[PDB]
């Protein structure tokens, strides 16, 4: 299982602050973090932790989007 | 072959902006970019692009460091020796 987090906003500084907090939080849980492109949006790919930890990181992404005033979409990939 | 970029500074908002700019630039080249973190040591690992591209990304790291007033260091691993 992989979770992809795509932040979107109309302030790049806010996007930057959210991205940094999200990735630091993800790795603190032992997840692997990689970056790819989703059109012209940067996507954070989170892997290597159990499904329930991925779900908590999803909730974290929502909280960060609210904190910094941006939006977020989540994609869960590879479930059986 | 791999290029690792480490960011240090006092203003976390500046570090965040430099990180985002660096990642966006590397991804645009079709590079693989992985994020790692040691207490205060923000680092990205860049693979999957030619040596010259890695070299150009290293110079972009140079420019970001000056632009945002942070310290950026670089490590090359798994590279070949050239003339």
What does this protein structure show overall?
2 copies of one chain form a homodimer. The first copy, chain A, is of the alpha+beta class and 80 residues long. Chain A has one domain (1-80): Ribosomal protein S10 (Alpha-Beta Plaits, 2-Layer Sandwich). In chain A, 44% of the residues lie in helices and 35% in strands. Chain A contains 2 helices and 4 strands; from the N terminus they run βαββαβ. In chain A, strands 2-3-1-4 form a 4-stranded antiparallel beta sheet, covered by helices on one side. In chain A, strand 2 (32-38) and strand 3 form a beta hairpin. In chain A, helix 1 packs antiparallel against helix 2 (51-68). The A-B interface holds A 12-13, 15-17, 19-20, 23-24, 27-28, 32-37, 42 and B 12-13, 15-17, 19-20, 23-24, 27-28, 32-37, 42. Strand 2 (32-38) of chain A pairs antiparallel with strand 2 (32-38) of chain B.
């Amino acid at each position: 299982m992989e979770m992809d987090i795509r932040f979107r906003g109309d302030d790049d500084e806010a996007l930057a602050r959210a991205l940094l907090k999200m990735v630091v939080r993800a790795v603190s849980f032992g997840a692997q973090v990689r970056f790819t492109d989703d059109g012209n949006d940067l996507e954070i790919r989170i892997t290597g932790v159990p499904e329930q930890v991925l779900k908590e990181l999803a909730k974290e992404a929502e909280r960060l989007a609210k904190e910094f005033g941006i939006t977020v979409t989540r994609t869960i990939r590879g479930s059986l």
